[PDB]
Design a protein around this nucleic acid. Structure first.
Ligand code: K
Ligand code: K
Ligand code: K
Ligand code: K
Ligand code: K
Ligand code: K
Ligand code: K
Ligand code: K
Ligand code: K
Ligand code: K
Ligand code: K
Ligand code: K
Ligand code: K
Ligand code: K
Ligand code: K
Ligand code: K
Ligand code: K
Ligand code: MG
Ligand code: MG
Ligand code: MG
Ligand code: MG
Ligand code: MG
Ligand code: MG
Ligand code: MG
Ligand code: MG
Lengths: 98, 50, 200, 147
RNA sequence: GCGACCCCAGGUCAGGCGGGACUACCCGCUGAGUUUAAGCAUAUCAAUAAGCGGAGGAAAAGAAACUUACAAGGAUUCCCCUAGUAACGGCGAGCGAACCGGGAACAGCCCAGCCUUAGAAUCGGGCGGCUCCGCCGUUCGAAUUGUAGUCUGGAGAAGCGUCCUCAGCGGCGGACCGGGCCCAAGUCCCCUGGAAGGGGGCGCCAGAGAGGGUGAGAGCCCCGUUGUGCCCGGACCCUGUCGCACCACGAGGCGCUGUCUACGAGUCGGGUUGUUUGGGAAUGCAGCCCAAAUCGGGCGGUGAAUUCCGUCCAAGGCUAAAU
RNA sequence: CCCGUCUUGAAACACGGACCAAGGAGUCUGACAUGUGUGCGAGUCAACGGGCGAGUAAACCCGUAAGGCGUAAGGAAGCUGAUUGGUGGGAUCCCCCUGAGGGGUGCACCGCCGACCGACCUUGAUCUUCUGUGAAGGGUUCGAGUGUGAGCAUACCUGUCG
RNA sequence: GUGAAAGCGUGGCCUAACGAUCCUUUAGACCUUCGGAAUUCGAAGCUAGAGGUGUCAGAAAAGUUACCACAGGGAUAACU
């Protein structure tokens, strides 16, 4: 949204024609190649899951999603990473079910 | 050891306002035009034309 | 302690006498820097002594956003718009900054115009005397080539001017204080209004 | 200047002006601000009220640039106008001088004092006080908001 | 029993490397108390002294997992200001940064990973040559548990166009530095003095009247000083010019793309303990426990959940100048 | 009565002093404060740095929207932000008359009381983006405020403090 | 509140009967802030009390020394 030209209120500031930032290679920092995804999947198949990952999967199988999230948080350290790990375990469980 | 040994960080220098410096310079220049003051300062100007 | 004096807070409880820095070498430092500048100018002759061209950038924060100063180097987008390859810009006296982002047109256009002016004012000697390439200058231009001592492109502000204008009824019937107060109130209550709208 | 120091006048007077009885000892009452509450309490209370205690909230990592807000008064607005602009405005009553106080470095306009008599003024600023805006309107000018 | 590999052992084997010394500055560790608080224990002294190590001519830092919230800046370092400020503190004594802004100087880069497989294109040693800080030939060895080449996020790979850019040698000077040789003028007359270099008189040089010596205050006695001239040697770096061949396979630049686009792990992060910091529900560091992710991860100075937004890309490495 | 010292009190049965020469103790620095001298003045300060220049550590010059202090204050903060006075004494000057007189003038300073800005309380027509604005009207409350600026630099003595 | 009312009542007929900073905790506001923007917890602010310093203008504090030490005191004991 363009600046209103006022020094107070919403969208305040000096009026300029805003420009979209030009694309740069750093826009793909969080992405990797299909080869890397394939290698990671194969190594996951070869190496299996960690004991705490198995515990989370068992809790999810039972149906204690809150307990699974709590265990993941206590293991990893943060709520965000615990949520991501619980979601990944849930996806693995769905794939196993199908 | 001497009492209160001298140190290098004594305030050696002075920061006089530029306006006062210019005042002093103008005063000295004006005085240089007075024959009485030039003689009083010890200069032999008895033979100077003007 | 005695009498009505400001409470003292001198920070002199360590071995501060061993960390005193004096400035008796100030004239010597000035002389050394001038000598280095002269040597560099002689070495880079006939290149300008002011250094490579720099972009025009805005001051940071609300205290200085009205000021224009010199930035580190021209952005990649500015170089692309001006038609100067980024690998060639440094070799012809143009500073390059691959980090600076271009968020508004005005700055990019200003820097592109600056680069165009620099190219118009630039004379490039051929790599080999007898060979003339695309970017090289003519012999007539090369002959009258001299070193510029000062800043060839000063970054100056547009001096303020007071103009006489007609005061219309629209301007006379504007409540600046009321506008400011209502904008402040809206900014303060935006969250509550959005919450109420979402609820209903 | 050592020769003007009063200790020079006290050469040959034994106590150097610090008394035979009391004398000049090292730190008879402690160092610095010692005893602010105990034996210097009277001094601290009578000359430095408010010294002890804390009030208000803290502000971690406070930067002053976001609070920068220079102010100018309407009695000082006219001084910003150049002389040629001033007499042009005096000659012509159909137009009013247009002052951008931001270019001179002011963010807010305050309403202290008075303006030149029978002179309209168009003032552009980031902020303005209610009294200043009222005075400008009464003078017959206008206020513009900018950032 | 032989052979291949692996790990290891002995060699005064052929050829190399290391230890220790110095202290003003520099880098890492360890680490007090005197003292101040008018007592004293947290604090302060001090992230100092002492102690243990490691370099250079500078070191260290350095190319954003940054600052900010702006109309945005853009490696590192240093100066001024910010500022005795925000903050910390038996909120007592005291302590105390950072960003913006103005200056000095400025410079950017190299790797790991998918990508020769029509053959490791790479490198070390011996030997023999050459215009010998290196190049060539040959032979052994290293290396596939990966040497070369391309690529490093600012990008890049691949494909198609543009025809825009890219290839040395030698001579003579300039610039810088270190040295050598020569080059002005009174020792005129008188007096006192052991001795004139002191006094008086008469002359002279001066881009040289800085300084020193000589029998007492010496511009002109001597060395020197000022300014020319000539001569010698380093540094092979910068710079001007001249003489000759100047080859674009290939690689770069620019434009396009309905294709790809690989980025560092017991590391980040979290819990806790100790220490430190202005960093305050915890600034950094370290021990122990847990332990990640790739439409993801770190930061946004009040802990927590939800929804957005801003900004960068750590866990590999090099780098002159301002000091 | 022998000096110096501490002392209510010293010639003291109070301490130091056998004698002479030379050396021997309120200093320098940082932060403030009053006073005074000097420059400028709503400004002031070029010495971080740059340009030079006694062939030169001096002197001279340079402030772009630099910075410090001042030029606005009140609130913890969000935030708001000086409507421009009256009166009693009072110096100087001008008139009438020569009384310790009368009229005009009324700077500095002091006393008293209003008004304005802000913290707090109170108050509320009209507009308004519904939470803001503010015609009128306030207060035994609070301020290191306003009501035609007085600072900045520099020198020295003195005083507190490290 | 009381009285019909004037009036009286801001603790006890009067002269004593009590307590700072920091921290904690309670009460009050459709109050302020958590500094990229919102909501909610949490935290931090403003005003008024409470938890106490009796050495009561308010450190957090056990002895012994004949094994003893220092700066002083005739401002102060043990003779004359
Ligand atoms: K005082
Ligand atoms: K005295
Ligand atoms: K006395
Ligand atoms: K607080
Ligand atoms: K070989
Ligand atoms: K490689
Ligand atoms: K990569
Ligand atoms: K990386
Ligand atoms: K840890
Ligand atoms: K992010
Ligand atoms: K005595
Ligand atoms: K005696
Ligand atoms: K200024
Ligand atoms: K308040
Ligand atoms: K009563
Ligand atoms: K007491
Ligand atoms: K004891
Ligand atoms: Mg280094
Ligand atoms: Mg200040
Ligand atoms: Mg800077
Ligand atoms: Mg070989
Ligand atoms: Mg003699
Ligand atoms: Mg000679
Ligand atoms: Mg400024
Ligand atoms: Mg109490």
């Amino acid at each position: 949204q363009p600046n209103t030209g006022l020094s107070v209120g919403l969208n305040k500031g000096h009026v300029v024609t805003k420009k979209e930032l030009a694309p740069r290679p750093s826009d793909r920092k969080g992405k990797t190649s299909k080869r890397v995804h394939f290698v990671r999947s194969l190594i996951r198949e070869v190496a299996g899951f960690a004991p705490y990952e198995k515990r989370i999967t068992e809790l999810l199988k039972v149906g204690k999603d809150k307990r699974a999230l709590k265990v993941a948080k206590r293991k990893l350290g943060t709520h965000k990473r615990a949520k991501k790990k619980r979601e990944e375990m849930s996806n693995a469980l769905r794939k196993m079910r199908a | 050891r001497m009492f209160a040994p001298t140190k290098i960080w004594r305030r050696w220098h002075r920061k006089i306002p530029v306006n006062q410096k210019r005042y002093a310079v103008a005063s000295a220049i004006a005085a240089s035009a007075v024959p009485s003051l030039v003689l009083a300062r010890g200069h032999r100007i008895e033979s100077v034309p003007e | 302690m005695k009498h009505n004096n400001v409470i003292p807070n001198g920070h002199f409880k360590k071995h501060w006498q061993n960390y005193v820095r004096t400035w008796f070498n100030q004239p010597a430092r000035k002389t050394r820097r001038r000598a280095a500048r002269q040597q560099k100018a002689v070495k880079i002759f006939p290149r300008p002594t002011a250094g490579s061209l720099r972009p025009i950038v805005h001051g940071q924060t609300l205290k200085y956003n009205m000021k224009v100063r010199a930035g580190r180097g021209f952005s990649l987008e500015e170089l692309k718009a001006a038609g100067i390859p980024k690998k060639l810009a440094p070799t012809i006296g143009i500073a390059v900054d691959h980090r600076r982002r271009n968020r508004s047109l005005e700055g990019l256009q200003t820097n592109v115009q600056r680069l165009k002016t620099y190219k118009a004012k630039l004379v490039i000697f051929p790599r080999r005397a007898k060979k003339v390439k695309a970017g090289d200058s003519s012999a007539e231009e090369l002959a009258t080539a001299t070193q510029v001592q000062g800043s060839y492109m000063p970054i100056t502000r547009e001096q303020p001017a007071v103009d006489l204008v007609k005061v219309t009824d629209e301007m006379k019937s504007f409540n600046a204080y009321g506008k400011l107060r209502i904008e402040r109130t809206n900014a303060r209550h935006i969250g509550a209004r959005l919450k109420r709208a979402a609820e209903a | 200047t050592t020769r003007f120091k009063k200790n020079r006048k006290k050469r040959g007077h034994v106590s150097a002006g610090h008394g035979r009885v009391g004398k000049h000892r090292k730190h008879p009452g402690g160092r610095g601000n010692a005893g602010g509450m105990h034996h210097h309490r009277i001094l601290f209370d009578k000359y430095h009220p408010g010294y002890f205690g804390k009030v208000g909230m803290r502000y971690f990592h406070k930067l002053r640039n976001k609070f920068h807000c220079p102010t100018i008064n309407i009695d000082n607005l006219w001084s910003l106008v150049p002389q040629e602009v001033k007499d042009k405005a005096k000659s012509s009553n159909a137009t009013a001088p247009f002052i951008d106080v931001t270019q001179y470095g002011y963010f807010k306009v305050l309403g202290k004092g008075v303006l030149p008599q029978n002179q309209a003024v168009v003032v552009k600023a980031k902020l303005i006080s209610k009294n200043a805006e009222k005075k400008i309107k009464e003078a017959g000018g206008a206020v513009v908001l900018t950032a």
